[PDB]
Amino acid sequence: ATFEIVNRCSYTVWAAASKGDAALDAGGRQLNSGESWTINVEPGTNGGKIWARTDCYFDDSGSGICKTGDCGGLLRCKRFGRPPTTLAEFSLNQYGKDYIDISNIKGFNVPMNFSPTTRGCRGVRCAADIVGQCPAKLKAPGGGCNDACTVFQTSEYCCTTGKCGPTEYSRFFKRLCPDAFSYVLDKPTTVTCPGSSNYRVTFCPTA
């Protein structure tokens, strides 16, 4: 499948694409304002994630630091990135269907639109100013808005026992962004697409 990743933000982002144990395609790339980066993702990929990193510095060998979304200091990510990270999550060719979603379960840093470029399903969007509105105890100094589980490490926030309810903190992400997961047992906002669809991930779709 083909993913076009577009940076519409006015600032530079360092996109990243990973399935947890390996990179998807090159795994990472600088995107200046307006730049598009298209990648091939192998069919059948389960649990692929795309996200943006902000305020990065890398050297010639591709080692550095990012203030949000860092993946162990590498430009080409092969593990997932450190929160806060708005997440585009996808599993492809699962019994003939594609499943996509946007997640705030690991926090928010960049607003995002996740849409198919082929026919037969809707896209999802989380474009609200969650960083501007972030509750005081969730603001990450590096920028962005942490999820409650990252901040507090309790069983209720992390849903470690498998039973948890919504929280004051999750209800905040849900009220600004209904189409995104706010906690792990949230009512699914997964969208089902025809198998082998193609997609575009757009950072800062509104402004």
| Residue ranges per structural domain of the chain | 1-207
Contact 114, 189 (CB under 8 A): no
Cα 129 to chain centroid distance, Å, stands at: 15
Among residues 98, 128, 123, which one has the least CA distance to residue 111? 128
Q: Which helix (H) or strand (E) holds 204?
A: none
> Cα dihedral sign for 88, 184, 144, 167?
positive
**CATH T-level fold of 1-207:** Thaumatin (2.60.110)
Among residues 88, 78, 80, 77, which one has the least CA distance to residue 113? 88
What resolution does the deposited structure have, in angstroms?
2.7
Question: Over the range 43-55, which residues count as b (16 or more CB within 10 Å of their CB) and which as e?
Answer: eebeebbbbbbbb
Report d(CA 117, CA 2) in Å as an integer: 9
Q: Tokens in use for 175?
A: 């009220």
Nearest-5° Cα angle at 21, 122 to 161? 75
Among residues 1, 46, 8, which one has the least CA distance to residue 25? 1
- E strands, the chain, where? 2-7, 13-18, 23-31, 36-40, 48-58, 64-68, 87-94, 97-103, 112-116, 124-126, 180-181, 191-194, 199-203
Q: Tokens in use for 180?
A: 């995104």
Number of C-beta neighbours around residue 188 at 10 A: 9
Q: Establish how many alpha carbons lie within 13 A of residue 205's alpha carbon, considering only the half-sphere containing its beta carbon.
A: 15
With 0-12 / 13-18 / 19 or more C-beta atoms within 10 angstroms meaning exposed / middle / buried, residue 83 is buried
191 phi-psi bin (left φ>0, alpha ψ -120 to 50, beta other): beta
